[PDB]
Design a protein around this ligand. Structure first.
Ligand SMILES: *[C@@H]1O[C@H](CO)[C@@H](O[C@@H]2O[C@H](CO)[C@@H](O[C@H]3O[C@H](CO)[C@@H](O)[C@H](O)[C@@H]3O)[C@H](O)[C@H]2NC(C)=O)[C@H](O)[C@H]1NC(C)=O
Ligand SMILES: *[C@@H]1O[C@H](CO)[C@@H](O[C@@H]2O[C@H](CO)[C@@H](O)[C@H](O)[C@H]2NC(C)=O)[C@H](O)[C@H]1NC(C)=O
Ligand SMILES: O=P(O)(O)OC[C@@H](O)[C@@H](O)[C@H](O)[C@H](O)COP(=O)(O)O
Ligand SMILES: *[C@@H]1O[C@H](CO)[C@@H](O)[C@H](O)[C@H]1NC(C)=O
Ligand SMILES: OC[C@H]1O[C@@H](O)[C@@H](O)[C@@H](O)[C@@H]1O
Ligand SMILES: [Fe+3]
Ligand SMILES: [Zn+2]
Ligand SMILES: [Zn+2]
Length: 341
């Protein structure tokens, strides 16, 4: 069958997808949707084959019968003798970051503060932090906890979108795709760097990747790590160097998903595409690179060393783990076993 149709989310990812489509000699073609959800539907219908998703969306995808095929792996310390493609995935840390100058803000005094979220339904940006607030607060009232937030994908007229800025001209406020200024890992972190919000729910790697001259993007150019603190669950605050002992949760890596009747095909094409455009691809730095997009995480997170085989041929609950599958179950009790679509 040999030709994969990718789903890009919003126009910037479409533009990266068209390029990959060019360089691959149409072995990969593109579809476009304004939202991760519309992309998942395009996959069910049969009009696209695959997309990379965050743990929170893999849960949506999986109730609809979709399946993880390959997982993003990043450069690890331990596990160094194995090749990247076969090496297990380590998971990322979900953290809550605050400005250091904001003395006195802790996990215990987040109520009525201003929040930056990656997007509704994502792991570190939404499910993990809102999950814990609901429990601790004993209330599905998670929409009234923060005075104001930017939480792409929530109702544009509610407080959950008060802090989102839309695109170049103000259109598309709160859409869950990179058109929204403060969408995604990088979005949320900006939303705090610029002091729009008081706290940002991102992952550990995002603090490092956008501070101390690692980015060269205008907003981040002068961000110093020493200016941030991680909020831990014990009430404490610690340097961003201590993420290992001050995190909300370890999240399952983002993974490529596809209908089950297409996974073997979507896998064969991906391992060959990354052998050409992956980190050491034949054609990576010279012609085109899959895992790069100047700090914008389009299609894949910029720090992806390689897409990895899963091994144990896991279902979507086994891939996500029972810890996580229970938190998403319990939090979705607030807003009964079916596919949303
Ligand atoms: C928010 O609070 C929820 C209510 O406690 C909590 O869900 C509960 O999570 C624990 C840990 O997953 C579960 O305990 C499980 O552990 C053993 C060993 O693996 C299992 O064999 C047990 O059957 C059990 O699943 C509870 O089951 C689960 N409770 C219920 C009623 O669903 C969430 O974890 C909290 N959310 C967050 C983000 O922390
Ligand atoms: C938090 O994230 C950063 C960045 O992803 C991790 O630091 C990297 O660590 C790797 C492997 O240890 C090094 O080769 C890199 O030089 C680091 N990147 C940068 C830009 O500093 C860090 O390890 C993560 N911290 C934890 C606890 O996982
Ligand atoms: O990888 C596969 C294996 O780890 C799974 O079986 C996990 O145990 C799963 O999270 C628990 O459900
Ligand atoms: C297109 O697919 C064919 C079939 O696998 C392969 O031999 C060819 O190299 C591919 N072209 C590129 C540049 O990916
Ligand atoms: O909490 C779930 C996550 O835990 C991490 O430590 C890894 O084991 C991942 O495989 C998993 O997705
Ligand atoms: Fe994520
Ligand atoms: Zn932990
Ligand atoms: Zn299994």
């Amino acid at each position: 069958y040999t030709r994969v149709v990718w789903c890009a989310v919003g126009p910037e990812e479409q533009k990266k997808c068209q390029q990959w489509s060019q360089q691959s000699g149409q072995n990969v073609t593109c579809a476009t949707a304004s939202t991760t959800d519309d992309c998942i539907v395009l996959v069910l219908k049969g009009e696209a084959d695959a997309l990379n998703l965050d743990g929170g969306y893999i849960y949506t995808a999986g109730k609809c019968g979709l399946v993880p095929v390959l997982a993003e792996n990043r450069k690890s310390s331990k596990h160094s003798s194995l090749d990247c493609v076969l090496r297990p995935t380590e998971g990322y840390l979900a953290v809550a970051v605050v400005k250091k100058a904001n003395e006195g803000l802790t996990w215990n005094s987040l109520k009525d503060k201003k929040s930056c979220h990656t997007a509704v339904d994502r792991t570190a940006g939404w499910n993990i932090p809102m999950g814990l607030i609901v429990n601790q607060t004993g209330s599905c009232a998670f929409d009234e906890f923060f005075s104001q937030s930017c939480a792409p994908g929530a109702d544009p007229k509610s407080r959950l979108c008060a802090l989102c800025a839309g695109d170049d001209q103000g259109l598309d406020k709160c859409v869950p795709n990179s058109k929204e200024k403060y969408y995604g890992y990088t979005g949320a972190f900006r939303c705090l760097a610029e002091d729009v919000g008081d706290v940002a729910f991102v992952k550990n790697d995002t603090v490092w990747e956008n501070t101390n001259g690692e980015s060269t993007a205008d907003w981040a150019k002068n961000l110093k790590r020493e200016d941030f603190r991680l909020l831990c669950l014990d009430g404490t605050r610690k340097p961003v160097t201590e993420a290992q002992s001050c995190h909300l949760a370890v999240a399952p890596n983002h993974a490529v998903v596809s209908r089950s009747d297409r996974a073997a095909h979507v896998e064969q094409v991906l391992l060959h595409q990354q052998a050409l455009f992956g980190k050491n691809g034949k054609n990576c730095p010279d012609k085109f690179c899959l895992f790069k997009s100047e700090t914008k995480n389009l299609l894949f997170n910029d720090n992806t060393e390689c897409l990895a085989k899963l091994g144990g041929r896991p279902t979507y609950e086994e891939y996500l783990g029972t810890e996580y599958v229970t938190a998403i179950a319990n939090l979705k009790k607030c807003s009964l076993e079916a596919c949303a679509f």
